[PDB]
Design an enzyme around this catalytic site. Structure first.
Site, PDB file in Angstrom:
ATOM      1  N   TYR A   1     -10.373   3.232   5.440  1.00 40.99           N
ATOM      2  CA  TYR A   1      -9.302   2.931   4.511  1.00 40.99           C
ATOM      3  C   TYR A   1      -9.725   1.813   3.570  1.00 40.99           C
ATOM      4  O   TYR A   1     -10.244   0.788   4.000  1.00 40.99           O
ATOM      5  CB  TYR A   1      -8.074   2.536   5.312  1.00 40.99           C
TER       6      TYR A   1
ATOM      7  N   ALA B   1       1.799  -3.486   3.007  1.00 42.14           N
ATOM      8  CA  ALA B   1       2.063  -4.904   3.155  1.00 42.14           C
ATOM      9  C   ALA B   1       1.433  -5.647   1.990  1.00 42.14           C
ATOM     10  O   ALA B   1       0.430  -5.213   1.424  1.00 42.14           O
ATOM     11  CB  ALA B   1       1.533  -5.432   4.493  1.00 42.14           C
TER      12      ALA B   1
ATOM     13  N   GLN C   1     -11.106  -4.194   0.282  1.00 46.76           N
ATOM     14  CA  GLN C   1     -10.650  -4.833  -0.945  1.00 46.76           C
ATOM     15  C   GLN C   1     -11.737  -4.826  -2.009  1.00 46.76           C
ATOM     16  O   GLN C   1     -12.923  -4.966  -1.707  1.00 46.76           O
ATOM     17  CB  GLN C   1     -10.237  -6.298  -0.716  1.00 46.76           C
TER      18      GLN C   1
ATOM     19  N   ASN D   1      -8.788  -0.021  -0.430  1.00 51.17           N
ATOM     20  CA  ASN D   1      -8.180  -0.124  -1.748  1.00 51.17           C
ATOM     21  C   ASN D   1      -9.192   0.152  -2.841  1.00 51.17           C
ATOM     22  O   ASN D   1      -8.831   0.698  -3.886  1.00 51.17           O
ATOM     23  CB  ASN D   1      -7.571  -1.513  -1.994  1.00 51.17           C
TER      24      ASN D   1
ATOM     25  N   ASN E   1       5.869  -9.884   5.954  1.00 56.50           N
ATOM     26  CA  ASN E   1       4.868  -8.967   6.496  1.00 56.50           C
ATOM     27  C   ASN E   1       4.880  -9.142   8.010  1.00 56.50           C
ATOM     28  O   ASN E   1       4.480 -10.184   8.526  1.00 56.50           O
ATOM     29  CB  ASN E   1       3.493  -9.278   5.896  1.00 56.50           C
TER      30      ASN E   1
ATOM     31  N   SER F   1       0.768  -1.220   0.000  1.00 53.06           N
ATOM     32  CA  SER F   1       0.000   0.000   0.000  1.00 53.06           C
ATOM     33  C   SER F   1       0.813   1.292   0.000  1.00 53.06           C
ATOM     34  O   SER F   1       0.245   2.346  -0.181  1.00 53.06           O
ATOM     35  CB  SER F   1      -0.896   0.041   1.246  1.00 53.06           C
TER      36      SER F   1
HETATM   37  C1  LIG Z   1      -1.681  -2.142   1.651  1.00 53.84           C
HETATM   38  O1  LIG Z   1      -0.576  -2.566   1.911  1.00 53.84           O
HETATM   39  N1  LIG Z   1      -2.847  -2.966   1.829  1.00 53.84           N
HETATM   40  C2  LIG Z   1      -4.182  -2.311   2.199  1.00 53.84           C
HETATM   41  C3  LIG Z   1      -4.299  -2.168   3.727  1.00 53.84           C
HETATM   42  N2  LIG Z   1      -3.203  -1.213   4.134  1.00 53.84           N
HETATM   43  O2  LIG Z   1      -3.207  -1.024   5.541  1.00 53.84           O
HETATM   44  S1  LIG Z   1      -1.616  -0.887   6.045  1.00 53.84           S
HETATM   45  O3  LIG Z   1      -0.891   0.109   5.173  1.00 53.84           O
HETATM   46  O4  LIG Z   1      -1.688  -0.224   7.414  1.00 53.84           O
HETATM   47  O5  LIG Z   1      -0.879  -2.199   6.072  1.00 53.84           O
HETATM   48  C4  LIG Z   1      -4.145  -3.488   4.367  1.00 53.84           C
HETATM   49  C5  LIG Z   1      -2.932  -4.216   3.964  1.00 53.84           C
HETATM   50  C6  LIG Z   1      -2.706  -4.323   2.441  1.00 53.84           C
HETATM   51  C7  LIG Z   1      -3.617  -5.250   1.716  1.00 53.84           C
HETATM   52  N3  LIG Z   1      -3.604  -6.616   2.124  1.00 53.84           N
HETATM   53  O6  LIG Z   1      -4.269  -4.878   0.805  1.00 53.84           O
END
Ligand SMILES: *C(=O)N1C[C@H](NOS(=O)(=O)O)CC[C@H]1C(N)=O
Ligand SMILES: [Cl-]
Ligand SMILES: [Zn+2]
Ligand SMILES: [Zn+2]
Length: 358
Positions: A147, A315, A117, A149, A340, A61
């Site tokens: 938060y 991660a 997601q 994606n 991770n 991320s």
């Molecule tokens: C980014 O690495 N992703 C989205 C989300 N980010 O939160 S973190 O930056 O605090 O790790 C969760 C982890 C990851 C994912 N599995 O998509």
């Protein structure tokens, strides 16, 4: 490197590696604007290939910082406005819940509860439309940060539409190439695979799998050298000769929302410096970082504050990354590992190092 840097890096990162069982790690400490590099362990355990300054790691991320800056660059080109409705760029998103959801909301996770997601079942463009068309928000736009994606991922995909370029081509030509990030990739070319570290999850070698909007949200791979140059670029945007990219960097560090002591930028997150270390450490735990939290709008957004702790965690299944920098102090750190391991351990180590060198 200066003895003080070598000392604090050894005393902080070697025990972190011991504590967390990290197979390979690369660290860049930016001190008075200059990077100092450190590596440990193996990119490929079974082949006994060491981590080097050319090893590619999955940023996870942390990729969002590139997306945020590319979006900022598009703002500076006049190609998009953050107040624009999502439907301006995707008119087929006709469902009524999208009325009122702007690019700002997508970029800053405030659209009203888009999920963490994109579902793994989404494999085609029509699958993706169906997903967003049927999504039902939990909250009114601009009230809660969750938060996601699926939020900034859609922002990135739509922000590049006025350019007529694919997301990857826009990123290559508007961000990576001007900044001479020549070993930073959305798709690792075959000739560069020899540099691509394996991630390790439960002892097994893994690479991130393809998914919808992956490039925008979590799919960039880079070296410690390129990531140090990315930090330098974000520390010193006036050194960037391309005006729209200089401005895009600055806009990604504007403060659009506040919750507690944290401010949301475009990709980047920020706190006032000096920071309470327990805030950034505890707030990086997934149980907090991924929780829905009410936000207060900052209108107009605060222009990038030099006395800030600016940072992003990332991660994948097999990798853990962290970037943090303080523009006022021309100080920063990049930590790339091929396991991770928990965010609070990353942030703690980073603050121990930068606190020692301020
Ligand atoms: C980014 O690495 N992703 C989205 C989300 N980010 O939160 S973190 O930056 O605090 O790790 C969760 C982890 C990851 C994912 N599995 O998509
Ligand atoms: Cl020691
Ligand atoms: Zn020691
Ligand atoms: Zn090369």
């Amino acid at each position: 490197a200066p003895q003080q840097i070598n000392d604090i890096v050894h005393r902080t990162i070697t025990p972190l590696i011991e504590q967390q069982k990290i197979p390979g790690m690369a660290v860049a400490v930016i001190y008075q604007g200059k990077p100092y590099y450190f590596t440990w362990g193996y990119a490929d355990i079974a082949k006994k290939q060491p981590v080097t300054q050319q090893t590619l790691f999955e940023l996870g991320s942390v990729s969002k910082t590139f997306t945020g800056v590319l979006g900022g660059d598009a703002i500076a080109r006049g190609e998009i406005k953050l107040s624009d409705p999502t439907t301006k760029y995707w008119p087929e998103l006709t469902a009524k819940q999208w009325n009122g959801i702007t690019l700002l909301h997508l970029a800053t996770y405030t659209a009203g509860g888009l999920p963490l997601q994109v579902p793994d079942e989404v494999k085609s463009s029509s699958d993706l439309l169906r997903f967003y068309q049927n999504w039902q928000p939990a909250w009114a736009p601009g009230t809660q940060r969750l938060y996601a994606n699926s939020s900034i991922g859609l922002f990135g995909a739509l922000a590049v539409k006025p350019s007529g370029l694919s997301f990857e081509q826009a990123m290559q030509t508007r961000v990576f190439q001007p900044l001479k990030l020549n070993h930073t990739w959305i798709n690792v070319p075959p000739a560069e695979e020899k540099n691509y570290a394996w991630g390790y999850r439960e002892g097994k070698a893994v690479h991130v799998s393809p998914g919808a909007l992956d490039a925008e949200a979590y799919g960039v791979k880079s070296t410690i050298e390129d990531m140090a140059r990315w930090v330098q670029s974000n520390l010193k945007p006036l050194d960037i000769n391309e005006k729209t990219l200089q401005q895009g960097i600055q806009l990604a560090q504007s403060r659009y929302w506040q919750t507690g002591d944290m401010y949301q930028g475009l990709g980047w997150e920020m706190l006032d410096w000096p920071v309470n270390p327990d805030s950034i450490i505890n707030g990086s735990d997934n149980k907090i970082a991924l929780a829905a939290r009410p936000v207060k709008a900052i209108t107009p957004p605060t222009p990038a504050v030099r006395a800030s702790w600016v940072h992003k965690t990332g991660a994948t299944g097999g990798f853990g990354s962290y970037v943090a920098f303080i523009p006022e102090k021309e100080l920063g750190i990049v930590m790339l590992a091929n396991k991770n391991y928990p965010n609070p351990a990353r942030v703690d180590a980073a603050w121990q190092i930068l606190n020692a060198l301020q």
